[PDB]
C-alpha cells in the first residue's frame, strides 16, 4: 500500500509517505482543541527539527556504567538459570557466594583453586584442552568470565583469515581515509604494512617506519595519528582538526568510546568510519599476534609465565649486584620501581623509565632490556594494547569448553545453543536463606493468616499475639496448644503447624537475649548472620565474616555461633516480602500472600509486572559510534516511524528508504595540491579554487588534457556518465569532443597524449586511478561500477537499518524463519543528488525547512523505484540475508543493463561521450516480474507537483531542559507566564498549589521550550523563554522562484523581473508575520541601491535575505554593503491571548488550546 522515506540529520528528520505511483497521500486528522476547528487536511510529508541540548532524552542516550552493569548481570542471570539445578546438587550456595572474596564454601577448595588457577585464563585453557571431566563450578566460572566480557561485535561473520590480515585492513584504512580527502589521497602502492606493523619493535618505531614508506606525511599528521592509534599509542587529534581543546585517544582506555563520541561531536560524524577502520586495524594486529585450542588464554598464560621468569631473574640479579636498591625496587609502592608498578600507581612508561638506567648499569642481562625496548618486559594481566577483543574468540573457547564437557554433563549438551546465544544475543535479586528469620516469619504468618475458628478469620492483634505467645515460646505449635491458648472449633490447620520459627529458637539458645531478636533495627544484622551461616560450611570463613559483629556479642557467644550452619535456600527474595511497599506484604500478612500479589487495587502486582521488564532502545543507540546529535536524530526517526505506522492504521509499510549524510578547508587542500604540483615542475588566490573549471585549469597547468595545446584562462568525464556517475575531479577533465572520440574511455589515438598525463601523475596533479582510467572498459569494471553506486559504506546507517528492521520484523514462521514484512532500503545520497540535478528538481537550503521533507520524498521515490527495477540487487542495499547474485550475468553484451549507470532508466534518452543518443522507452518496467517501475510522462509530473505544494508539516520539537528553566507554566489572580527551574521543579511536582501560593488552579498548562502559538493573519510564534519569542512561520515559495534562484546564484536573463517579484513576496511575508519594518525598509532600500549589480550576485544576496524570514531565532545577516541586525521579540504578552498549538511529532495530530 505504501512506503516511508526519511532524511536523517543531526538537527532534523525529514519524512514522507508514498504510494505505488509515488503520490503523497492527503489525510484528514482530528483537532482536539477547544477551538471550533474539528478536522484538518494534511499531506503525509514533513520534517522534524530538533535542538541538541540537555534533556532527559539526551542523558538517556549517553553510556553509563550502571546500564552496562545491569546488562552483564542479566546475561549472567540467564547463565545461572541454566546451571541452577545441577549446581544445587553440587553446591547449593555457590551462586550466592559470588560478588578478596571466597568463591568456595570452604578453605580447602578455595586455596586449591587459586593455587591451580592463578588467572582465569589458566582455567579457560585447561577447560578447553583437557579431556577429563571437570567440576561444574569451574566450567561455570570460565563460561561466566567469557559471557561477562564478551567483547565487541564489529565483525559480523564467523571469523575468517581476512579478518587477521594486517595488509588488507591497512588498505581499508587508507581507502576510507582517501574517501574523506579526495584532494590529497594517500598512496598505499606496494607498502609492506604487515611486516612493519607486526614487527617486534617499539610502537613508536613501527610508526616512524610505516610513515617512512609514505612520502609527504609527517608523524603528527592525521593518518599518522590514526596509525599511532592502531599501534597502541595515544595520539592527540586537536592539532589535526584545529580543536580548541585536547583530544587524546587510546583504544585500550575504558573511556575511548565516549571520548571518540566527543571528538565526533566536534569534527562531525563523517570521520567515525575512519576511526572504526583504525580500530579494525588494531584488531588485525592483535589477532595476527595471538594466532601466531584457546590461543587467547594461551597467550595470556604466556604473558604470565614470561612475566614471572623475568621477575625471578630480575630479582636474582638485583640481589647479586645492587642489594641497596632491592627493597626500593620490589617493596616500595611509593617509588616507580616494580612495587609501584604492580601495586602502586605507576604507568608502564614511568616504570620502564625507572628501571632503564638500572638494567643498563646492571650488565647482568641485556635480554630484559630487549624486552623492555619492545615493551614486553613485565606486562600485566589487566591490559590489551589498544583494543577490545572480538567476541568470536570467546565464542570459540565457549564452544570448546562446552563440546569438551557435554558428555559428562548432559544439560550442557542440551542447552549448548542457548549458552552460546546468551553470549551472542543483544525479580532482580536472589532468594533468602530458607532458615532466615524473615523467611520463617513470612511462612508462619502466611500460614497463620488463613485460620477459621468460628464460634457461636484471625485478627492482626490476634496474629501478633499468637506468634509472640506460641511461635516464639514453643519451637513448634501443635493445634491442641492453639485451642488451649484460645481458652486462656478451629479450621485451616492440621494436627500441628508445619511452619516454625526454628532459627528464632536456635539463635535464642545461643545469643541468650530475647530483646535483641525482638528489636527490628537489628534485623539486617541477623539476616547477614544467617546468610553467612548458609553461605559457608567452613568455620574459619564464618568466623572471618562474623568478626564485623564481634563487639555486639560475647566471645563465647561467637564461638557458639560458629558451630551453627544452615543448608537450605528459600523461594522468595527479601524485598518481595519487606522491600516493596503500598505497606509491605509482610505488613499485610500481619488476605493471602498470593491473593495479595493478585489484587489490582494493591500496588505489588504493578510493581512486579514492571519489575520483570524493568531504556533498551536508548541504550542500544547509546553504544553506537556517533555524536549525541546524530543519535538523538536516530531516536526521532524511530519515533516518527512509529507514528507514521499509527497514522496508516497499523499496516506496515512495504518499504523504508533511509539516507544519512552530512548536509573553505577543501580550498586549502586544493591549494596544497596546486602548490606542490606546480613546485614539482597568472597567480590567483584560493577562494575561487572552488570553481571547477579554474581548479581543473590549475591542476592541468594551463593546458588541455586531450590536445596538447595550452588554454587561456578566460569539461568531460573520463569514464562516461552512461557507465557511471562520477562528478568527482578524479573522473573530470578540462578540455576544448576533441580527445573523447567514442563511448570508450579517451581514444587510443589520444592515448599518445599519455606522457603529459604521466608528468601530471608524478606531480600529484592527477591520481593514479585517473591515470589508469585515461589510459584505458572491461565488463568487470562495469560490475565494480554497479556495486559502487548502490552500497552504502557508512556504518551508522547500517545500524539504523538494523534497528528499523528489528522494530519492523518480529513475527516468526513455523520453521522459525523470520517473516520479513518490511524492507529497509539505504540509499546513497549521490543518487538523489544527481536525480535532483538531471531532472531540474533544485534545492535551496535557505528558503525554508521544506528541503528535508522533499529529500525524504525523493529518497522514497528513488529507493522504491530502484528495488522495483532491480530486485536481484536486493542484497546490496536492503537489510537482511539475501542471495548475492552473480553480477556478471546481469551485465550484458551490447544487445539488466549494458550501460552500468543504475539511474539511467529514469532518463528518456541518454547522451553518450561521443554525443550519440540512446533513446529509452517512455515507461520503464521489470522484465522478470512484469511490474511497472517508472512512467516518464506522469511520474515526473507527480514529483514536480509534490515538491510544489505549499503545505508541509514542519515541527520544531518542544523540549524540557534537565539559573536554567525546564519549562514555563501558564499561571492563573491574572494571566501570566512563570519559569520553573530544575531545582524548583521537584517541590513543584509534589505540592504545586502551595508553591504557586508561595509565589503569590483548575488549569495546569506546562509550556515546553519552542511551544507553538498562533495569532492573527496566519502568524506563529514559539516560546523560547518566558522572556522571549521566536518566529514560527515557514515562508513557502513557488517552485519557479526557487529554481530561478538556484539557476541565478549558480550562474535565462529574460526572467530578470522575478527578482522584483521575489523581493515583493519576501516583503509581503515580512509584513504579514515577521513584523520588523524598520529592517525591511533598509532591505528594500539596499535592493534599490544595487540593481546595477549582475543578476548572480543579486540572487545570492536575495538568498541571504531569507534569514530574516527563517523560522526560529532571529539572526543578523548581510545584504550587499548593508548589514541587518536581528530583531528579538522580547515581549511574550501577545502569546497569552494567542491560540496554543500542541503538535504531534509528525505534526499531523494537533490540539489547539485557545484562551483569551
**Residue 324 sits in the site that holds Mn ion (CB under 5 A):** no
The residue at minimum Cβ distance from Mn ion is 502
Residue 620 known to bind ligand? no
CA angle 605, 610, 615 (to 5 degrees): 175
Which cell is 1018 given?
496566519
Q: How far apart are CA 662 and CA 269, in angstroms?
A: 8
Catalytic residue among 391, 717, 851, 854: 717
* Minimal distance, residue 135 CB to Mn ion, in Å: 29
Question: How buried is 906 (Cβ within 10 angstroms: 0-12 exposed, 13-18 middle, 19+ buried)?
Answer: buried
Residue whose CB is less far from Mn ion, 10 or 767: 10
Q: How far apart are CA 985 and CA 960, in angstroms?
A: 11
Residue whose CB is less far from Mn ion, 113 or 842: 842
* Minimal distance, residue 497 CB to Mn ion, in Å: 13
Residue 939 known to bind ligand? no
Sign (positive or negative) of CA dihedral 35, 39, 40, 44: positive
Contact 1031, 1021 (CB under 8 A): yes
**Residue 9 sits in the site that holds Mn ion (CB under 5 A):** yes
Quote the strand ranges of 589-724, DSSP E: 655-660, 716-717
Region of 497-505, 539-547, 576-584, 964-972 interacting with Mn ion (CB under 5 A) = 497-505
Helices within 726-849 (DSSP H only) = 754-762, 768-774, 779-790, 795-808, 829-838
* Minimal distance, residue 722 CB to Mn ion, in Å: 24
Residue 162 known to bind ligand? no
Q: Residue 710's beta-bridge partner residues?
A: 703
For residue 616, which of 70, 27, 34, 15 has the smallest C-alpha distance?
70
Residue whose CB is less far from Mn ion, 475 or 1019: 475
Contact 534, 435 (CB under 8 A): yes
Q: Say which residue the cell 591490559 belongs to.
A: 383
* Minimal distance, residue 850 CB to Mn ion, in Å: 10
* Ranges within 657-686 binding Mn ion (CB under 5 A): 659, 663
Region of 9-17, 89-97, 329-337, 862-870 interacting with Mn ion (CB under 5 A) = 9-17
Q: How far apart are CA 517 and CA 510, in angstroms?
A: 11
Contacts of residue 279, Cβ cutoff 8 Å, sequence gap at least 6: 154, 229, 230, 251, 387
Residue 1090 known to bind ligand? yes
Contacts of residue 139, Cβ cutoff 8 Å, sequence gap at least 6: 127, 401, 405, 409, 412
Catalytic residue among 7, 51, 261, 726: 7
Active site residue 717: yes
Instruction: Give me the 794-833 binding string for Mn ion, x by CB under 5 A, dash otherwise.
Output: ----------------------------------------
**Residue 1121 sits in the site that holds Mn ion (CB under 5 A):** yes
Q: At what angle do helices 222-231 and 166-180 cross, to 10 degrees?
A: 150
Contacts of residue 142, Cβ cutoff 8 Å, sequence gap at least 6: 120, 123, 124, 127, 397, 401
**Residue 7 sits in the site that holds Mn ion (CB under 5 A):** yes
Region of 94-102, 451-459, 927-935, 1117-1125 interacting with Mn ion (CB under 5 A) = 1117-1125
Q: How far apart are CA 644 and CA 652, in angstroms?
A: 9
* Minimal distance, residue 12 CB to Mn ion, in Å: 5
Region of 5-13, 165-173, 453-461, 557-565 interacting with Mn ion (CB under 5 A) = 5-13
Sign (positive or negative) of CA dihedral 76, 81, 86, 88: positive
Among 502, 784, 1038, 1112, binds Mn ion (CB under 5 A): 502
For residue 1033, what are the CA distances in angstroms to 843, 844, 1113? 20, 17, 11
* Minimal distance, residue 1086 CB to Mn ion, in Å: 8
Region of 102-110, 229-237, 433-441, 796-804 interacting with Mn ion (CB under 5 A) = 433-441
Among 126, 137, 371, 435, binds Mn ion (CB under 5 A): 435
Residue whose CB is less far from Mn ion, 435 or 725: 435
Count of CB atoms within 10 A of residue 1111's CB? Answer: 17
Residue whose CB is less far from Mn ion, 13 or 541: 13
Residue 659 known to bind ligand? yes
Residue whose CB is less far from Mn ion, 364 or 502: 502
Residue whose CB is less far from Mn ion, 14 or 1032: 14
Q: What DSSP line would sit under 385-428, residue for residue?
A: TT-PPBHHHHHHHHHHHHHHHTTT-HHHHHSHHHHHHHHH----
Q: Residue 909's beta-bridge partner residues?
A: 919
Which cell is 979 given?
519559569
For residue 764, which of 667, 666, 680, 871 has the smallest C-alpha distance?
680
Residue whose CB is less far from Mn ion, 731 or 849: 849
With CB under 5 A as the rule, give the number of residues binding Mn ion.
10
Q: Are strands 823-826 and 965-971 parallel, antiparallel or unpaired?
A: unpaired
Q: At what angle do helices 523-535 and 539-546 cross, to 10 degrees?
A: 160
Contact 385, 232 (CB under 8 A): yes
Q: Say which residue the cell 592483535 belongs to.
A: 286
For residue 803, which of 824, 818, 786 has the smallest C-alpha distance?
824
Residue whose CB is less far from Mn ion, 152 or 565: 565
Count of CB atoms within 10 A of residue 522's CB? Answer: 15
Which cell is 145 given?
568470565
Region of 75-83, 502-510, 910-918, 1135-1143 interacting with Mn ion (CB under 5 A) = 502-510
* Minimal distance, residue 9 CB to Mn ion, in Å: 5
Tell me the helix, strand and coil percentages in the chain, rounded to 5: 50, 10, 40
Instruction: Give me the 595-614 binding string for Mn ion, x by CB under 5 A, dash otherwise.
Output: --------------------
Residue whose CB is less far from Mn ion, 379 or 852: 852
Q: Is 30 helix (H, G, I), strand (E, B) or coil?
A: strand
* Ranges within 555-584 binding Mn ion (CB under 5 A): none
Q: How far apart are CA 462 and CA 442, in angstroms?
A: 16
**Residue 538 sits in the site that holds Mn ion (CB under 5 A):** no
* Minimal distance, residue 501 CB to Mn ion, in Å: 8
Which helix (H) or strand (E) segment holds residue 763: the answer is none
Helices within 322-378 (DSSP H only) = 326-330, 338-342, 348-362, 367-373
* Minimal distance, residue 662 CB to Mn ion, in Å: 8
Active site residue 109: no
Q: How far apart are CA 340 and CA 7, in angstroms?
A: 55
Instruction: Give me the 837-856 binding string for Mn ion, x by CB under 5 A, dash otherwise.
Output: ---------------x----
Helices within 949-1018 (DSSP H only) = 982-990, 992-999
Residue whose CB is less far from Mn ion, 110 or 663: 663
Residue whose CB is less far from Mn ion, 661 or 969: 661
Instruction: Give me the 641-660 binding string for Mn ion, x by CB under 5 A, dash otherwise.
Output: ------------------x-
* Minimal distance, residue 1073 CB to Mn ion, in Å: 24
Region of 2-10, 91-99, 393-401, 800-808 interacting with Mn ion (CB under 5 A) = 2-10
* Minimal distance, residue 1046 CB to Mn ion, in Å: 8
Residue 1121 known to bind ligand? yes
* Minimal distance, residue 568 CB to Mn ion, in Å: 8
Region of 627-635, 792-800, 1033-1041, 1112-1120 interacting with Mn ion (CB under 5 A) = 1112-1120
**Residue 404 sits in the site that holds Mn ion (CB under 5 A):** no
Q: Residue ranges for the binding site for Mn(2+)?
A: 7, 659, 663, 852, 1090, 1121
**Residue list for the binding site:** 7, 659, 663, 852, 1090, 1121
Which stretches of the chain bind Mn ion, using CB under 5 A?
Answer: 7, 9, 435, 502-503, 659, 663, 852, 1120-1121
Q: Which residues are catalytic?
A: 7, 717
Amino acid at each position: 500500500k505504501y512506503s516511508i522515506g526519511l532524511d536523517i540529520g543531526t538537527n532534523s528528520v525529514g519524512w514522507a509517505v508514498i504510494t505505488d505511483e509515488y503520490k503523497v497521500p492527503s489525510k484528514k486528522f482530528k483537532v482536539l482543541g477547544n477551538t471550533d476547528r474539528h478536522s484538518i487536511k494534511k499531506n503525509l510529508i514533513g520534517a522534524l527539527l530538533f535542538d541538541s541540548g540537555e534533556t532527559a532524552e539526551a542523558t538517556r542516550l549517553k553510556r553509563t556504567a550502571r546500564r552496562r552493569y545491569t546488562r552483564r548481570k542479566n546475561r549472567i542471570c540467564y547463565l545461572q538459570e541454566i546451571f541452577s539445578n545441577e549446581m544445587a546438587k553440587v553446591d547449593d550456595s555457590f551462586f550466592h557466594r559470588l560478588e578478596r572474596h571466597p568463591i568456595f564454601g570452604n578453605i580447602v577448595d578455595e586455596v586449591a583453586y587459586h593455587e591451580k588457577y592463578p588467572t582465569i585464563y589458566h582455567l579457560r585453557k585447561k577447560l578447553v584442552d583437557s579431556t577429563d571431566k571437570a567440576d561444574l563450578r569451574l566450567i561455570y566460572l570460565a563460561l561466566a568470565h567469557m559471557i561477562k566480557f564478551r567483547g565487541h561485535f564489529l565483525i559480523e561473520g564467523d571469523l575468517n583469515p581476512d579478518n587477521s590480515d594486517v595488509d588488507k585492513l591497512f588498505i581499508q584504512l587508507v581507502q576510507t581515509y582517501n574517501q574523506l580527502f579526495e584532494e590529497n589521497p594517500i598512496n598505499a602502492s606496494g607498502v609492506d604494512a604487515k611486516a612493519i606493523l607486526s614487527a617486534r619493535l617499539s610502537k613508536s618505531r613501527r610508526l616512524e617506519n610505516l610513515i617512512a614508506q609514505l612520502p609527504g606525511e609527517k608523524k603528527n599528521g592525521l593518518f599518522g595519528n590514526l596509525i599511532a592509534l592502531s599501534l597502541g599509542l595515544t595520539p592527540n587529534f586537536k592539532s589535526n582538526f584545529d580543536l580548541a581543546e585536547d583530544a587524546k585517544l587510546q583504544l585500550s582506555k575504558d573511556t575511548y568510546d565516549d571520548d571518540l563520541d566527543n571528538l565526533l561531536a566536534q569534527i562531525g560524524d563523517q570521520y567515525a568510519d575512519l576511526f572504526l577502520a583504525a580500530k579494525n586495524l588494531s584488531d588485525a594486529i592483535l589477532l595476527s599476534d595471538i594466532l601466531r585450542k584457546a590461543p587467547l588464554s594461551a597467550s595470556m598464560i604466556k604473558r604470565y609465565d614470561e612475566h614471572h621468569q623475568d621477575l625471578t631473574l630480575l630479582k636474582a640479579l638485583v640481589r647479586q649486584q645492587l642489594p641497596e636498591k632491592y627493597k626500593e625496587i620490589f617493596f616500595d609502592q611509593s617509588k616507580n620501581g616494580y612495587a609501584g608498578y604492580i601495586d602502586g600507581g605507576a604507568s608502564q612508561e614511568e616504570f620502564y623509565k625507572f628501571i632503564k638506567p638500572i638494567l643498563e648499569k646492571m650488565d647482568g642481562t641485556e635480554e630484559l632490556l630487549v624486552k623492555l625496548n619492545r615493551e614486553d618486559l613485565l606486562r600485566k594481566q589487566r591490559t590489551f594494547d589498544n583494543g577490545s577483543i572480538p567476541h568470536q574468540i570467546h565464542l570459540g573457547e565457549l564452544h570448546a569448553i562446552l563440546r569438551r564437557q557435554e558428555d559428562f554433563y548432559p544439560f550442557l549438551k542440551d542447552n549448548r545453543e542457548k549458552i552460546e546465544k546468551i553470549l551472542t544475543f543483544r525479580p532482580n535479586e536472589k532468594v533468602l536463606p530458607k532458615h532466615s528469620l524473615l523467611y520463617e516469619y513470612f511462612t508462619v504468618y502466611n500460614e497463620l493468616t488463613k485460620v477459621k475458628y468460628v464460634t457461636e478469620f484471625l485478627s492482626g492483634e490476634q496474629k501478633k499475639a499468637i506468634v509472640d505467645l506460641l511461635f516464639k515460646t514453643n519451637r513448634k505449635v501443635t493445634v491442641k496448644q492453639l485451642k488451649e491458648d484460645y481458652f486462656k472449633e478451629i479450621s485451616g490447620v492440621e494436627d500441628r503447624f508445619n511452619a516454625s520459627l526454628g532459627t528464632y529458637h536456635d539463635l535464642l539458645k545461643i545469643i541468650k537475649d530475647k530483646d535483641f531478636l525482638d528489636n527490628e533495627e537489628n534485623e539486617d544484622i541477623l539476616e547477614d548472620i544467617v546468610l553467612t551461616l548458609t553461605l559457608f560450611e567452613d568455620r574459619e570463613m564464618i568466623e572471618e565474616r562474623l568478626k564485623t559483629y564481634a563487639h555486639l556479642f560475647d566471645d563465647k557467644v561467637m564461638k557458639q555461633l560458629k558451630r551453627r550452619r544452615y543448608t537450605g535456600w528459600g523461594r522468595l527474595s527479601r524485598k518481595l516480602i519487606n522491600g516493596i511497599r503500598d505497606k509491605t506484604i509482610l505488613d499485610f500478612l500481619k488476605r493471602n500472600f498470593m491473593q495479595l500479589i493478585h489484587d489490582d487495587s494493591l500496588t505489588f502486582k504493578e510493581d512486579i509486572q514492571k519489575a520483570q521488564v524493568s531504556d533498551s532502545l536508548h541504550e542500544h543507540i547509546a553504544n553506537l559510534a556517533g555524536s549525541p546529535a546524530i543519535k538523538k536524530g536516530i531516536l526521532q526517526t524511530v519515533k516518527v516511524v512509529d507514528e507514521l505506522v499509527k497514522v496508516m492504521g497499523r499496516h506496515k509499510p512495504e518499504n523504508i528508504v533511509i539516507e544519512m549524510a552530512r548536509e573553505q578547508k577543501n580550498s586549502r587542500e586544493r591549494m596544497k595540491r596546486i602548490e606542490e604540483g606546480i613546485k614539482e615542475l597568472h597567480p590567483v588566490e584560493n577562494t575561487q579554487l572552488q570553481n571547477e573549471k579554474l581548479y581543473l585549469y590549475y591542476l592541468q597547468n594551463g593546458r588541455d588534457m586531450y590536445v596538447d595545446q595550452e588554454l587561456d584562462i578566460n569539461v568531460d568525464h573520463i569514464v562516461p556518465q552512461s557507465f557511471l556517475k562520477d562528478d568527482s575531479i578524479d573522473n573530470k577533465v578540462l578540455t576544448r569532443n576533441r580527445g573523447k572520440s567514442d563511448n570508450v574511455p579517451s581514444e587510443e589515438v589520444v592515448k599518445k597524449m599519455k606522457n603529459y598525463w604521466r608528468q601530471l601523475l608524478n606531480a600529484k596533479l592527477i591520481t593514479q586511478r585517473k591515470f589508469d582510467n585515461l589510459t584505458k572498459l572491461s565488463e568487470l569494471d562495469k560490475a565494480g561500477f554497479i556495486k559502487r553506486q548502490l552500497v552504502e559504506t557508512r556504518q551508522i546507517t547500517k545500524h539504523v537499518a538494523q534497528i528499523l528492521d528489528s522494530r519492523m520484523n518480529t513475527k516468526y514462521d513455523e520453521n522459525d524463519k523470520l517473516i520479513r514484512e518490511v524492507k529497509v532500503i539505504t540509499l546513497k545520497s549521490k543518487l538523489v543528488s544527481d536525480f535532483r540535478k538531471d531532472f531540474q528538481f533544485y534545492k535551496v537550503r535557505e528558503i525554508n525547512n521544506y528541503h528535508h521533507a522533499h529529500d525524504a520524498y525523493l529518497n522514497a521515490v528513488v529507493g522504491t523505484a530502484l528495488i522495483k527495477k532491480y530486485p536481484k540487487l536486493e542484497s546490496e542495499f536492503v537489510y537482511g540475508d539475501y542471495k548475492v547474485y552473480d553480477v556478471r550475468k546481469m551485465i550484458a553484451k551490447s544487445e539488466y543493463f549494458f550501460y552500468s549507470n543504475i539511474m539511467n532508466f529514469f532518463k528518456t534518452e541518454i547522451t553518450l561521450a561521443n554525443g550519440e543518443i540512446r533513446k529509452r522507452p517512455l515507461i520503464e518496467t521489470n522484465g522478470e516480474t512484469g511490474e511497472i517501475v517508472w512512467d516518464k510522462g506522469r511520474d515526473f509530473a507527480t514529483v514536480r507537483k509534490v515538491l510544489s505544494m505549499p503545505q508541509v508539516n514542519i515541527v520544531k520539537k518542544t523540549e524540557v531542559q534537565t539559573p536554567t528553566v525546564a519549562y514555563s507554566v501558564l499561571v492563573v489572580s491574572v494571566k501570566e507566564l512563570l519559569g520553573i527551574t530544575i531545582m524548583e521543579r521537584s517541590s513543584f511536582e509534589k505540592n504545586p498549589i502551595d508553591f504557586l501560593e508561595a509565589k503569590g488552579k483548575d488549569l495546569i498548562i506546562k509550556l515546553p521550550k519552542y511551544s507553538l502559538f498562533e495569532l492573527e493573519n496566519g502568524r506563529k510564534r514559539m516560546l523560547a523563554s518566558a522572556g522571549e519569542l521566536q518566529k514560527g512561520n515557514e515562508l513557502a515559495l513557488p517552485s519557479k522562484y526557487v529554481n530561478f534562484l538556484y539557476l541565478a546564484s549558480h550562474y535565462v536573463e529574460q526572467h530578470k523581473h522575478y527578482l522584483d517579484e521575489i523581493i515583493e513576496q519576501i516583503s509581503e511575508f515580512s509584513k504579514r508575520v515577521i513584523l520588523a519594518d524598520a529592517n525591511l525598509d533598509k532591505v528594500l532600500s539596499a535592493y534599490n541601491k544595487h540593481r546595477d549589480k549582475p543578476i548572480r550576485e543579486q540572487a545570492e544576496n536575495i538568498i541571504h535575505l531569507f534569514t530574516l524570514t527563517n523560522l526560529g531565532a532571529p539572526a543578523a545577516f548581510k545584504y550587499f554593503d548593508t548589514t541587518i541586525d536581528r530583531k528579538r521579540y522580547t515581549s511574550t504578552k501577545e502569546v497569552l491571548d494567542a491560540t496554543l498549538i500542541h503538535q504531534s511529532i509528525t505534526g499531523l495530530y494537533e490540539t489547539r488550546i485557545d484562551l483569551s
